[PDB]
Amino acid sequence: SIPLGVIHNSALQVSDVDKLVCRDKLSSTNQLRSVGLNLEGNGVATDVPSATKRWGFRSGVPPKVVNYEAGEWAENCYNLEIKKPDGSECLPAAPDGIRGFPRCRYVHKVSGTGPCAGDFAFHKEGAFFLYDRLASTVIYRGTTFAEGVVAFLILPQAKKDFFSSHPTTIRYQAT
Amino acid sequence: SIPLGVIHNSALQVSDVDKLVCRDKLSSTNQLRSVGLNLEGNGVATDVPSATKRWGFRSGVPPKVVNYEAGEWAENCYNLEIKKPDGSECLPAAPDGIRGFPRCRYVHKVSGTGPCAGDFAFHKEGAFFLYDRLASTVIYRGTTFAEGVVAFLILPQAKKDFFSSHPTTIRYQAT
Amino acid sequence: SIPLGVIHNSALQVSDVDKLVCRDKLSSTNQLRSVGLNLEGNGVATDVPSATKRWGFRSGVPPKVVNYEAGEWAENCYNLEIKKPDGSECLPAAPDGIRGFPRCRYVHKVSGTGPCAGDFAFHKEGAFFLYDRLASTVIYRGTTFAEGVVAFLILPQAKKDFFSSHPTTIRYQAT
Amino acid sequence: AIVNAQPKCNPNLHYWTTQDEGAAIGLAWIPYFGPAAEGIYIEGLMHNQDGLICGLRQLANETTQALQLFLRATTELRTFSILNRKAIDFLLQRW
Amino acid sequence: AIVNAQPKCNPNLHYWTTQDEGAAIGLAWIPYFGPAAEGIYIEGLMHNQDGLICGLRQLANETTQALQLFLRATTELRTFSILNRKAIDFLLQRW
Amino acid sequence: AIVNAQPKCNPNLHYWTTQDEGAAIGLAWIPYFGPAAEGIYIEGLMHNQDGLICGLRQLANETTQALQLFLRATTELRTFSILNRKAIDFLLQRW
Ligand SMILES: *[C@@H]1O[C@H](CO)[C@@H](O[C@@H]2O[C@H](CO)[C@@H](O[C@@H]3O[C@H](CO)[C@@H](O)[C@H](O)[C@@H]3O)[C@H](O)[C@H]2NC(C)=O)[C@H](O)[C@H]1NC(C)=O
Ligand SMILES: *[C@@H]1O[C@H](CO)[C@@H](O[C@@H]2O[C@H](CO)[C@@H](O[C@@H]3O[C@H](CO)[C@@H](O)[C@H](O)[C@@H]3O)[C@H](O)[C@H]2NC(C)=O)[C@H](O)[C@H]1NC(C)=O
Ligand SMILES: *[C@@H]1O[C@H](CO)[C@@H](O[C@@H]2O[C@H](CO)[C@@H](O[C@@H]3O[C@H](CO)[C@@H](O)[C@H](O)[C@@H]3O)[C@H](O)[C@H]2NC(C)=O)[C@H](O)[C@H]1NC(C)=O
């Protein structure tokens, strides 16, 4: 029951695949797109102290990953290298294929010795962590990520593609 | 060539996709389901001395895995830790995603100095090994499994899903 | 924009699905096939001194793999074990699933030191490296491969498939 | 069509499956608050419906041969697309 | 239809995406000569069209609940087939 | 339609496709008894059919450009869905 959006004459409306009339014609498989939107645009605070308080550790839930094709510029992105007091690395190492968010104006790198208390780090408000083009539910060590959400669309058939219109870093401690 | 089952009027028939009349109307992708059933229901003996004679070691055949969505309760389940005499572990380590069988009334833990003389352990009668929701052709170390087989179905269209109706361990040595 | 080849009356023509009229209709998903062809049939030189000049090293480009279902016999195949002068391995270890080309009438083993200057070895002319039934853009260590390209086809419908019709090595020093 | 040949056939079927439709209670959909991997299943019973359960057990016994040969050909380590392929083959036959 | 219920919604959208058909300028299609992983993107701006951008942001907020539960069920580690499934489910409903 | 431009074109083609629906003997379908990975292939010769084999080689030389630009875009490490997507696009365009 994943909602799917339909665009006609630059208006947006929700539609189950069953509700589609013949008017909202879907002719080719390249009309279907997935877009990942950073939630900085929804007014959230983006400083490191406020962002750290929205990530938490848990055990017993396996990670998951989903693909997204288009994205958005991020004004702030994060990079985490937290450690346990004994020197062990808390977060998992990045699996092959996950590189990092392609576009960030600023990248916050956080390193410290705050005690993690679980197997993985999740998002307490349900949002995803966005990498180059793979959205994940977990934080991976050393890889830049941007907080965001994913949406699915049926784009209009046109001679020009929908996605063709008008074509620093700081380090802080933690505990 | 994989047979596909169709349910109508609470009866089961075999019909490849070629023979489907419009009467057995497939309407949405939710109707297609894969079900994994255990051998215990077909009358097979399940004491450990009889179970181990039904698995054998071989080399030169890559392992394979297939997904299955629904399953059955298992009264007997097996966990294996076999070592060749020098102390090396014979069975492969479980890859990421493989996980124990969810529901198991009793779990037999078997460990001992087997003469295992192959690269992988296979089923000598063609049955799969059921792990979580992944059916495998090979045994993995330390993960519970139940012997079973997989079936494919086209479920009836209804207001209530078909799979919604009426909603200890022992340690033994081996060689 | 990947072309499809359509066969009718033992003639071949290019026809994307945009213009695949009913005269060349599909009926089942087993008609679609992918065929991997070797460069040696197109007249390329195959002696080792001339073959190595068409492979080169680069960094910053992720490797990729694509599946192909049909193939061709190779008169010459290659196996590589290059090393840096310090003794380290120059090429990636083969990931699980890569098993080497199944049919080679002769296999060249090339093993010697070379000033490797990149993460991976690519093909300078855009060709793929054919491993078993997987086509890769990068050379893996110790696995036989044949240089080739991939083509996609819509086979004719018949009682007898398009296929099934009419049913050693040297070592070379390097520097 | 199908007829049971096994020496014994258990008529009941205690099943478990994972539901993905609908909405959860409050915050339960957030992974940080949701249940562990051992608590995502739902369970039921096809009480005393022997006429159908006996058929499933026999079909699974016969389906193994075709499935094993299919997995031999494929070079994908984990297969998830068998049902999708059959959906496509259904459409292409009556397009 | 969709109405935003979130503070300080951003009207603009500086997108980036990968062009599937590629540029194909001369030899640039060969990976040994092509751009690095950081250079395969194209980017623009959907200027001041807040009537559509505001809708997209709200849809993503609501789509999260359904997507999370779906991922909880599937046993595959990386999911790529959501759109293809919706393409099949569109066809199967049409007669 | 297609015209060969390569300096030489071999007219014969030996193939080694695998078979998914073979009529296996009683016990050959069990992996414990079946052939090793080197024995699952079937071989044959498309004798002297120059008119098709020459065209087939040329099409491959032209499909590399489109295929590699496609692989540059995808995040998948291994791609298996190219033919399935083309099947879906065939059905959708019959609108
Ligand atoms: C599907 O069900 C049939 C019927 O139950 C299963 O057939 C069984 O196959 C095994 C292995 O070939 C037979 O074992 C053999 O039995 C005799 C002694 O009875 C002996 O010659 C051999 O040493 C061997 O053990 C077994 O008898 C046979 N069962 C019956 C009732 O005929 C079949 O295995 C099932 N298929 C799958 C994939 O589970
Ligand atoms: C989708 O957007 C909604 C808003 O439309 C987001 O709701 C936000 O939910 C969080 C909790 O998950 C709320 O935090 C709570 O706020 C109050 C502040 O007084 C307080 O009672 C609690 O201490 C707690 O912090 C937050 O206020 C709420 N935002 C708004 C604007 O109401 C929701 O998180 C978004 N969903 C996703 C997946 O991003
Ligand atoms: C598809 O087939 C064509 C030929 O039909 C292949 O073109 C060949 O491309 C290579 C590499 O660009 C050319 O090599 C160059 O040739 C000249 C003359 O020696 C020289 O300037 C350079 O040193 C370089 O070696 C080659 O000449 C050309 N072949 C022909 C007959 O023109 C093409 O590579 C094939 N594509 C694939 C993907 O295999």
PDB file of C-alpha atoms in Angstrom, chain B residues 25-97:
ATOM      1  CA  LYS B  25      -9.074 -14.506 -12.896  1.00  0.00           C
ATOM      2  CA  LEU B  26      -5.729 -13.273 -11.622  1.00  0.00           C
ATOM      3  CA  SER B  27      -6.303  -9.619 -10.765  1.00  0.00           C
ATOM      4  CA  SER B  28      -3.383  -8.348  -8.682  1.00  0.00           C
ATOM      5  CA  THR B  29       0.139  -9.366  -7.737  1.00  0.00           C
ATOM      6  CA  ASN B  30      -0.881 -10.010  -4.111  1.00  0.00           C
ATOM      7  CA  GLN B  31      -2.551 -13.272  -5.150  1.00  0.00           C
ATOM      8  CA  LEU B  32       0.709 -14.947  -6.193  1.00  0.00           C
ATOM      9  CA  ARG B  33       2.188 -16.654  -3.134  1.00  0.00           C
ATOM     10  CA  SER B  34       4.949 -19.134  -2.331  1.00  0.00           C
ATOM     11  CA  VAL B  35       4.471 -21.568   0.555  1.00  0.00           C
ATOM     12  CA  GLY B  36       7.077 -23.780   2.204  1.00  0.00           C
ATOM     13  CA  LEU B  37       5.859 -27.036   3.744  1.00  0.00           C
ATOM     14  CA  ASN B  38       7.770 -29.401   6.013  1.00  0.00           C
ATOM     15  CA  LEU B  39       8.526 -33.054   5.348  1.00  0.00           C
ATOM     16  CA  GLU B  40       7.415 -34.027   8.854  1.00  0.00           C
ATOM     17  CA  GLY B  41       3.809 -33.839   7.677  1.00  0.00           C
ATOM     18  CA  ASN B  42       4.434 -36.425   4.958  1.00  0.00           C
ATOM     19  CA  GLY B  43       5.391 -39.127   7.470  1.00  0.00           C
ATOM     20  CA  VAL B  44       9.197 -39.013   7.436  1.00  0.00           C
ATOM     21  CA  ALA B  45      11.089 -40.157  10.523  1.00  0.00           C
ATOM     22  CA  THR B  46      12.848 -37.339  12.362  1.00  0.00           C
ATOM     23  CA  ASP B  47      14.973 -38.833  15.141  1.00  0.00           C
ATOM     24  CA  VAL B  48      18.562 -37.626  14.813  1.00  0.00           C
ATOM     25  CA  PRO B  49      20.045 -41.049  13.887  1.00  0.00           C
ATOM     26  CA  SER B  50      17.606 -41.229  10.969  1.00  0.00           C
ATOM     27  CA  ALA B  51      17.964 -37.581   9.935  1.00  0.00           C
ATOM     28  CA  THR B  52      21.746 -37.530   9.497  1.00  0.00           C
ATOM     29  CA  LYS B  53      21.586 -40.464   7.070  1.00  0.00           C
ATOM     30  CA  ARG B  54      19.511 -38.209   4.796  1.00  0.00           C
ATOM     31  CA  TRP B  55      22.247 -35.555   4.337  1.00  0.00           C
ATOM     32  CA  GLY B  56      25.563 -36.049   2.567  1.00  0.00           C
ATOM     33  CA  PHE B  57      28.677 -34.139   1.581  1.00  0.00           C
ATOM     34  CA  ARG B  58      29.724 -33.232  -1.957  1.00  0.00           C
ATOM     35  CA  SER B  59      31.983 -30.828  -3.833  1.00  0.00           C
ATOM     36  CA  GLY B  60      31.764 -29.128  -7.207  1.00  0.00           C
ATOM     37  CA  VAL B  61      28.143 -27.923  -6.999  1.00  0.00           C
ATOM     38  CA  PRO B  62      27.579 -24.248  -6.066  1.00  0.00           C
ATOM     39  CA  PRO B  63      24.883 -23.643  -3.441  1.00  0.00           C
ATOM     40  CA  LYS B  64      21.650 -21.838  -4.242  1.00  0.00           C
ATOM     41  CA  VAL B  65      18.855 -20.083  -2.360  1.00  0.00           C
ATOM     42  CA  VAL B  66      15.247 -19.187  -3.178  1.00  0.00           C
ATOM     43  CA  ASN B  67      12.698 -17.051  -1.350  1.00  0.00           C
ATOM     44  CA  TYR B  68       9.467 -18.336   0.197  1.00  0.00           C
ATOM     45  CA  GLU B  69       6.881 -16.166   1.926  1.00  0.00           C
ATOM     46  CA  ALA B  70       4.632 -18.412   4.054  1.00  0.00           C
ATOM     47  CA  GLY B  71       5.465 -21.482   6.095  1.00  0.00           C
ATOM     48  CA  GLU B  72       4.369 -24.050   8.671  1.00  0.00           C
ATOM     49  CA  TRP B  73       5.010 -24.909  12.314  1.00  0.00           C
ATOM     50  CA  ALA B  74       7.751 -27.505  12.801  1.00  0.00           C
ATOM     51  CA  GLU B  75       7.668 -30.073  15.585  1.00  0.00           C
ATOM     52  CA  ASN B  76      11.312 -31.102  15.076  1.00  0.00           C
ATOM     53  CA  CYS B  77      14.174 -28.832  14.042  1.00  0.00           C
ATOM     54  CA  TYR B  78      17.931 -29.344  13.697  1.00  0.00           C
ATOM     55  CA  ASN B  79      21.074 -27.361  14.490  1.00  0.00           C
ATOM     56  CA  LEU B  80      24.467 -28.653  13.380  1.00  0.00           C
ATOM     57  CA  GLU B  81      28.074 -28.032  14.481  1.00  0.00           C
ATOM     58  CA  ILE B  82      30.242 -30.689  12.820  1.00  0.00           C
ATOM     59  CA  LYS B  83      34.044 -30.740  12.976  1.00  0.00           C
ATOM     60  CA  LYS B  84      36.543 -32.817  11.046  1.00  0.00           C
ATOM     61  CA  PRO B  85      39.047 -34.582  13.297  1.00  0.00           C
ATOM     62  CA  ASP B  86      41.808 -31.961  13.087  1.00  0.00           C
ATOM     63  CA  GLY B  87      39.439 -29.358  14.581  1.00  0.00           C
ATOM     64  CA  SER B  88      38.484 -27.473  11.419  1.00  0.00           C
ATOM     65  CA  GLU B  89      34.843 -26.528  10.948  1.00  0.00           C
ATOM     66  CA  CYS B  90      33.290 -28.481   8.073  1.00  0.00           C
ATOM     67  CA  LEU B  91      30.087 -26.556   7.420  1.00  0.00           C
ATOM     68  CA  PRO B  92      30.125 -23.052   5.897  1.00  0.00           C
ATOM     69  CA  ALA B  93      29.408 -19.939   7.922  1.00  0.00           C
ATOM     70  CA  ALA B  94      25.981 -18.377   7.530  1.00  0.00           C
ATOM     71  CA  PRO B  95      25.924 -15.418   5.113  1.00  0.00           C
ATOM     72  CA  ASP B  96      24.190 -12.177   5.983  1.00  0.00           C
ATOM     73  CA  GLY B  97      20.422 -12.571   5.783  1.00  0.00           C
TER      74      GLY B  97
END
